[PDB]
DNA sequence: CGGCTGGAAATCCAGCCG
DNA sequence: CGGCTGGAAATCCAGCCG
């Protein structure tokens, strides 16, 4: 038998909530959650309907999934992860209690004793090759599932992980957001100053993403024109084309070079004078 | 005797340090210290020329005047207080190297035993006496006299108290600063939109201030209008001739209701439409 | 020009909700 | 009323400098 992600969890957003904060930290949703139709992370048990167990633990991003740090809080969590019974009689399973405890950059050492302690290596990462800076503003889930061949002895099927999800509150991966710009029209010819009021960005790893069909062009400004994180003061690039004819509503976005993600896109009508 | 401050320290323009950010430079200024040319805290004793000794101890700044939990550190200081020889040929005594250093409030409850443990404490406040909430942006120098009376034999003349000395890093306390603003020139009928790029402010606490001679107007905007503190996006006000056939170069800056103080202005260009 | 350090950046709670 | 939610408060760098 074989899991797979049904639904995967939101990527960014959420950010992990720290123990001095609470004992749950909220509830990590499916990517297509929305506020209308609301999702979980949910698993798909491929070649089997039946008795069996699941655990959900955190592991690193890149390729040596060394356990990570952080905890799973939530219902049925202990020791940084998720556990508990399958349901029998369904091959599908959501987790709608799911949330991420961040450790400190202190209690890291701390944290990695209790993964070892309490047997959490999913991926039987070595002791050796266990060692290592950690990824504190992202992680990944490890669903761990245990049905049982056909003779009836409990069976481990292989660990599955999900793309990994971000700490919102991470100045350096926070989720791209555009709040309020001064202005979403203007010259084709470009050149029009923009104030942009967003969340927190780096002004070296920050960029103002222009994007029509078969067009793309970015906004023009220096670092220095990043205001506290979360201001940008750049001028609009020229249209493709200075002869236009008609408003021409394209695309502004927030675009972070090194990982390439992008913000919701704003909309901007280019006009002619 | 008696202690007479004759020089009370500067109650605003100071932060208080972090044991975290180390030596880097402190002196708690007198109420006029400037330039290269300063004013330090000096006290004068009456009634007395001969040897002695002073120690300066920071006290709440609220009746039971309790030993501070916060320190005094710099030259001469130990356990969060200063104590040095007074000088047995002069009676006016000035204070050069001042420094409060501020704990974390999660380091209070040493703080206070540090107190004890090495007696400080110039009013003799009592254990039980000790109870209550310490305000920790505030404090107030004691300074502690001891001289020699007639006998010879040591005497200790009242706490003498300064006002109390507040703190910089307080987040309504700071200088005000506008850094970039979107347009500085407008319509005199007002109501135009303006973005304002600033130094951390609270919102709960600023305002956009017009001015000109025997003339003055405010912007308009709310609590949400606060970008993160660090910018505000509000109209201008109609001038006084809203009706006007020519420039006017009235100011335009940052106000804080609190205590009234304003940022450096910007020069703002009213003009007829 | 390699350290010193000031500014910039990283690391509890009021108001919402149902 | 208990969780939330999202703001704010607390707690490495460039550029100067010797």
């Given at each position: 038998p074989y899991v797979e992600i049904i639904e995967q969890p939101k990527q960014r957003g959420m950010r992990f909530r720290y123990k001095c904060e609470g004992r749950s930290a909220g509830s990590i949703p499916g990517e297509r959650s929305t506020d209308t139709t609301k999702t979980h992370p949910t698993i798909k048990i491929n070649g089997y309907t039946g008795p069996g167990t699941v655990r959900i633990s955190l592991v690193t991003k890149?390729?040596?999934?060394?356990?990570?740090?952080?905890e799973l809080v939530g219902?049925?969590?202990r020791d940084g992860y998720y556990e508990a019974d399958l349901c029998?009689?369904?091959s599908i399973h959501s987790f709608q209690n799911l949330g991420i405890q961040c450790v400190k950059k202190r209690d890291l050492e701390q944290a990695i004793s209790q993964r070892i302690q309490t047997n959490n290596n999913p991926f039987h990462v070595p002791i050796e090759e266990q060692r290592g800076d950690y990824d504190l503003n992202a992680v990944r889930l490890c669903f761990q599932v245990t049905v049982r061949d056909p003779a009836g002895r409990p069976l481990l099927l292989t660990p599955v992980l999900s793309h990994p999800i971000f700490d919102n509150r991470a100045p350096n991966t926070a989720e791209l957001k555009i709040?309020?710009?001064?202005?979403?029209s203007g010259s084709c010819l470009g050149g029009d100053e923009i104030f942009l009021l967003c969340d927190k960005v780096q002004k070296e790893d920050i960029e103002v993403y222009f994007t029509g069909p078969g067009w793309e062009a970015r906004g023009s400004f220096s670092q220095?024109?990043?205001?506290?994180?979360v201001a940008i003061v750049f001028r609009t690039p020229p249209y493709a084309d200075p002869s236009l004819q008609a408003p021409v509503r394209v695309s502004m976005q927030l675009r972070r070079p090194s990982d390439r993600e992008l913000s919701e896109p704003m909309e901007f009508q280019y006009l002619p004078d």
């Open positions: 890149d390729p040596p999934h060394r356990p990570h740090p952080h219902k049925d969590c029998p009689d369904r709040c309020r710009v001064n202005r979403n220095a024109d990043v205001h506290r994180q």
